[model samples]
Target chain A: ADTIVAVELDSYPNTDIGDPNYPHIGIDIKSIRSKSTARWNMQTGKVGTVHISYNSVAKRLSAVVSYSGSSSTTVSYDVDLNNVLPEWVRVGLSATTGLYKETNTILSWSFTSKLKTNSAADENSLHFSFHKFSQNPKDLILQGDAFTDSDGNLELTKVSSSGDPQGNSVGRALFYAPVHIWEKSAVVASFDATFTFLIKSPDREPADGITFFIANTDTSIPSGSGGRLLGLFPDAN
Target chain B: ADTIVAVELDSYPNTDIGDPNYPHIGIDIKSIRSKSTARWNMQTGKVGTVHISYNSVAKRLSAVVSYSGSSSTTVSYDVDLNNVLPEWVRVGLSATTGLYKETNTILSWSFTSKLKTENSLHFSFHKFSQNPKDLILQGDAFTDSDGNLELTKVQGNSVGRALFYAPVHIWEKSAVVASFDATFTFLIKSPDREPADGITFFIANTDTSIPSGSGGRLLGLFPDAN
Candidate 1:
């Protein structure tokens, strides 16, 4: 009876045994030409060889091969996720040989799974999951405050009364807020979602005699959020 | 019946007797009060002084008063054109015996009639008129043959082509005529006119690979009466 065979391979420097200062500069592979064998070469001349290895498991055969190359070398191979092994396969080659030896070399691996019967219940499974959250109430109603800077101009605090939920949960809130102080002859209101607040001066001119001061705050956060404090709109100069 | 008694006094510069350099100034009176009934003051300053005069015929009135300490000073009372004079009236003043003599300043006066009135015509008199035999047209067009500066660029000659006709009248030619030649780009062509012949070079995207001589030129004669 034909048997299933799977093989995975990785490469590393083995620098602990090799020269630590320069490490293994390159890798060389020696193999004999045989019938049931195929060889693949990357654009950089790195070669990956595949051949059959006989195994006495249920009187069947298996496939095995080794890749010898530096971590920077590219390995060309195609992956078919539709056919997967029943068990987790760990394939990697470390620059260090023993348990304690270590090297600063990159390692990569490729896996191949073959089944005895072509239709024997393709051994691959996939699952997808998503998490949804409700909008937070606090993000909807936020009020802005007002303040003054070193200059005598009036400044409004950026107030975010609403916020999206934190970490995987969706939330929203109503933001109802006002500027900090209302001058007798000056009025302020938000223009758009951008923390741009319009200040109408007593001069009754649109954008005349008006000044703008931007607060370094996260206007996106709910009013009470830490980052929202910096958002501000200042009055005329 | 009350007599319609009126006094008409007129004065002019005595050009025959006054010094040509110094003239005596006098006012013309269309009407004046008689001495017994005239207004004046001298000793007690009780009589109301006549400070203003009026022309009952023209209905125009003016006042004269000394300014500062200068007796030669004079001022005009408000003169309403419609209420004072007919549509046309001529006012004249003369300096016959004063610092300025023999100066007769006559103003041919008239009121601005309603627009489109027959009497409201502009002065259409010519002092001297002549027609030249050759009809010589001499002016600058802007460019010259071989494309050298005829009149330096951006200097006095930079005026528009229409201004060139100010010193001369444009003549009507029955046949095509070679009037003048100044080699400059006829830059503008109005409606119903053709541009003059010239090479127009487009110098955009100039580079070493593309020699300056590779530029293209458009040549043609601008056809129009300018």
Candidate 2:
């Protein structure tokens, strides 16, 4: 009845790292792994999966994967834990679509510990760590502002007024950084995080919107490194 | 200290019922046994005295008799104790002029118990009783319209305008009926009592020296006895 399994991280292949058209860094996961092969076993098995995506306009990076199964099914999945950091993974869902379409469905993501290999230490290797960041649908209010990183500079992102003033809206912003891992001490580890911006304006009145901002250097300086700007999708009204 | 003395009421030899104009009544004490001087022990050297007067208009009979000694000086007076009754009594100090000027005094007419006399067959003498019919003061403002009397009958003795309203500004209506000896019962008493025909009024603003009756009654009312 009890089983102890080591957490594993999978990396995504075929990411367009240099393409000008897409211009986004990404990782993918193949078929999720299963502990049991049978249909019932697979239905009951647990699989770990992870995915990352970015929106350039909103300048946001979102990643999510989860495990779910019963005793009859063996489920498994690979997560790109190396190139991705759990704290940097910002997940969001559209109120009108993502949450409303999948009522009562539990979505989750996981990561493995840092694994050592004989050849070279893949600092980008899949590692095990607690996925600390999570977002709920109700926490996402449409009419707020956001702070983002734009070309290594901090900027304020505002909600747009394009769609129907009372319909579904989408706003996205992305940030790119060359520095991968940032370490505060020998024990403290974190990613050299770049900020993103996203906003969901109220469907009825766009004027009554909430604002979101981020400070990069944590100093009094108004303008510093890691600044960006972006907006959200507007409602159709 | 107590001592025994005999008192006797004897008939007078002559009742000098003086002039009817200014009538005066007196009694002469006499002893059946003739004695130029009667000797008796002056107990504690004390003596008693008596004074009496009568008034016709007010129908009052009054007497003042007193005894003075080392122990006490008791003086008592009564008005209207006799058969002859006077209307009212003038109290307070008397001036040297007219009747007597008395001030800051109370003039009350009240009833007292009937007097009893000792006789062989138990006899009783009733004084002539009177009921005060009405009262009126002399003034333009004091009239029958503002004043009233509650009795079997009322008659105005005299009517005249007041020379000055400063001394007596208000005239009261009162009624008194004899009860017994020297006192009478007040059947009705109303200070500032008004006459039925009398009315108080204020002069017009435009007029300064207007005569009486220029204005109408401002307060109080008169009632028809019927």
Candidate 3:
């Protein structure tokens, strides 16, 4: 048996079990069974874009439709994909207007996946490549001055207030999963991390520095963390 | 003329080459003349495994034949492969039943070669006691037996550096971008005092030394004049 997940826009309603009375949008998981549906008029004579995303942690698949001259509409369904899908599966898109002909054109589309490997070796490895972060990244925890810019960069410090006395800042971006560094009386894992970053100080002197470190999964900024501390330790006398 | 090298199991003795009357194994180079020969008795209805190996440095080619219920026999010859064969040549295997029809079943075959260039290289130093073959280390950097990388000793003002021996491709003519990632674990332990100075991961086009007076806040990243 094959597992199928689909988003369908039914322009013609045939009064079937999964079909609605009017043109409607719906999501299906296994068979041609609509789990959730939202009424939508498709013959608006306007081009539109569709964004579909799945959050495995939340067990939710969300879809958004944005038209050229109209506001966007969003809908989501809750289902654990592992329950109904195989370890690996194919993704596809298709459209039909039934006996009466109508045009359905998909202008452009893109897909991204951060599926975790279940093998012992791969389970200990983490990889991330981000082209943009306008939306919050689900796997990265940002703290203090850390933020993702609209221009597709992870900024660690606020550059706007760099000249002021309060401009000294610290930030951190950490992986969401807890890594096993060691076990009782034995080495659990050995890992490496590499990333690309740019640090610039336009007005001369660049104070302090940045570093990569390993700490407890629940670690947080210290009470007096600031300046040269890089959010790792509290200020000392 | 084809410069042929072969190992033949000759069952019929042809007196023209003065082969022994008994079934034997012989090494042939460029012609049917046997450079080396060993008496072998291969009976019908019995399967034998033939192992051939060539040590390029020693220029020795050896062969061993073994049957399921019997001992094995070995024979070898010395020949410089480069002098007798082209830079590239095709390898093949052939067998003959001769006059009588019989089945020659090759149950399995495997070949391995280590004569290819490396497109990428990666090395991990989990325990860094010995000299790292893939890295260019400088200054006071040394590894202890306890698997710790000692960049500099516990005493004052010191600097050390280590780099990958080969260059990494980062970009292409302003048209495309390349992504690279690396991870390492380090410890800066000063048994008697607070740790002085810091360590940095440096990337450069060529080997770059730590500039004089590059300590404290600079973290060995910038020159002394800055």
Q: Pick the candidate with the highest DockQ.
A: 3
Model 1 lDDT vs. the true structure? 0.18
Q: Cα deviation in Å at residue B48, candidate 3?
A: 43
Order the candidate numbers by lDDT, best to worst.
3, 2, 1
In candidate 3, what are the lDDT values of residues A1-237, reduced to their tens digit?
133455544444545454566655566665444578777545344555566666556677666565667776655789766555543332322332212322222222233333233332121222223333323544356666665555435555554433221255555665443332222222122232223233333323333333333344455655555543334544322
Alpha carbon lDDT of each predicted model:
0.18, 0.19, 0.44
Question: Which lDDT tens digits does candidate 2 get at residues A1-237?
Answer: 011111111111112322112111222121112121112111112342334333222323343333333222122323333323322222221111111110101122222212122222112212211111112111122222222222221112221233212222222121111111222111222221111222223222121111111112111111111111012111111
Q: Output the number of the TM-score-best candidate.
A: 3
- Angstrom error at residue B185, model 2: 99
Mind giving the per-residue lDDT tens digits that candidate 1 earns over B80-190? 233322222221110111111111111111111111101222211111113212111112223233332221122111211111111211112221110110111111111
lDDT string for model 3 (B1-226, tens) is 3345555555543555465656666666654556787866564545555666554456676666667777866667897655565432333222322222232333322222222110111223333324443345566655554434555543344556565443332222221222222333333333322222333333343435555554433333344311
Reference A-B contact fraction recovered by candidate 1: 0.00
Cα deviation of B49, candidate 1, in Å: 28
Tens digit of lDDT per residue, candidate 1, span A139-226? 1232232322233222222212231111111111112222111111111111101011122122111110101111112222222221
The interface root-mean-square deviation of each model, in the order shown, is 59.5, 67.1, 15.5
TM-score of chain A of each: 0.16, 0.20, 0.48
